[PDB]
């Protein structure tokens, strides 16, 4: 039963198709890979074959498995009767899918089947809009593709020269481990305007507390705040590396400026600013099973006049996609 | 819905 011999040399994949080759990961866009596969000869329980993803795509997308040993279960490959033909997992770090045959295969031959698995952007490795190679290995054979990411720009806000402007994206949600963490990137003033008396609010909900599982609080939330040297260098994908020299962490300058006084919201007092800041949120959600929905808000004035107030909000929520597959062999 | 939205897979769990 345990993972045994690699039988890529016995498995041929075919009729490979992506569901689509262009989408917008900032509006829940994703694709699927679909392929047929067939086994030449016989395999035995524990034999396995693999598929390997390149830098531009991931199998997990905005779902985070770092608290589950970087491993995600995948849907079982099942026969018509419903019997499990292969169990499958995916390694987040090595981007490798492994399909391990069960004892169903022991008395069979010329097993063949098919799968459809959801594929997502890699926000870190594909940080800008554009076209990327997405050459995918299945069973030691390459299937070449191009994928185009047209990210909805994170640079959004009120249409005045001193207008409030802010955006965010939840780029990691831990659904597996039980810890219920989430990771959110917030871009404050991505327009890089000159703003007076700036306040930012990070909420664990949108309009209705009871309709989100998010919990923002001093004990559930940690914030890191970075001043951005060059705004042009920020991702379109909302990925932001805390170690990138373009970001200067200034968290220690905000110890008197962050308040969890109000319900399910953190407020941050930015004051008079003229740069973009990144806020990396490490949060948690509760066990109500409600959707995780959030909103960030920024308000400010015109610093030269003291007036021309404005306020802008930005909602986040994520969606889940599923895979499926089947296989049968002759006796 | 407004703002932006993400997407991922839980591996059918
Ligand atoms: Mg092969
Ligand atoms: Mg509170």
Residue numbers in the entry:
A (entry chain A): 209 to 539
B (entry chain Q): 9 to 21
What does the paper say about this structure?
ClfB plays a key role in establishing human nasal colonization by binding to the human type I cytokeratin 10 (CK10) expressed on squamous epithelial cells. As a bifunctional MSCRAMM, ClfB also binds to fibrinogen α (Fg α), which is assumed to be significant in platelet activation and aggregation and has been shown to contribute to the pathogenesis of experimental endocarditis in rats. In this study, we solved the crystal structures of apo-ClfB and its complexes with fibrinogen α (Fg α) and cytokeratin 10 (CK10) peptides.
To study the molecular mechanisms underlying ClfB-ligand recognition, we solved the crystal structures of ClfB(208–542) in complex with CK10 (amino acids 499–512, referred as CK10(499–512)) or Fg α (amino acids 316–328, referred as Fg α(316–328)) at 2.3 Å and 1.92 Å, respectively. In both complexes, the peptides adopt an extended conformation and are inserted into the tunnel formed between N2 and N3. In ClfB-Fg α(316–328), the residues ClfBArg529- Ser542 that are disordered in the structure of apo-ClfB become well defined following Fg α(316–328) binding. The distal C-terminus of ClfB(197–542) forms a short β-strand G′, which forms a parallel β-sheet with the β-strand E from the N2 domain. The ligand-induced stabilization of the C-terminal peptide of ClfB allows it to run across Fg α(316–328) on the top. This binding mode is consistent with the DLL model as demonstrated in SdrG-Fg β complex. Taking the Fg α(316–328)-ClfB complex as an example, within this motif, the G1 is limited by the side chain of ClfBW522 with the limitation of the space and is also required for the Fg α peptide making a turn thus exiting the tunnel. The S2 is the most critical residue because it not only forms two hydrogen bonds with the side chains of ClfBW522 and ClfBQ377 but also binds to the main chain of ClfBS376.
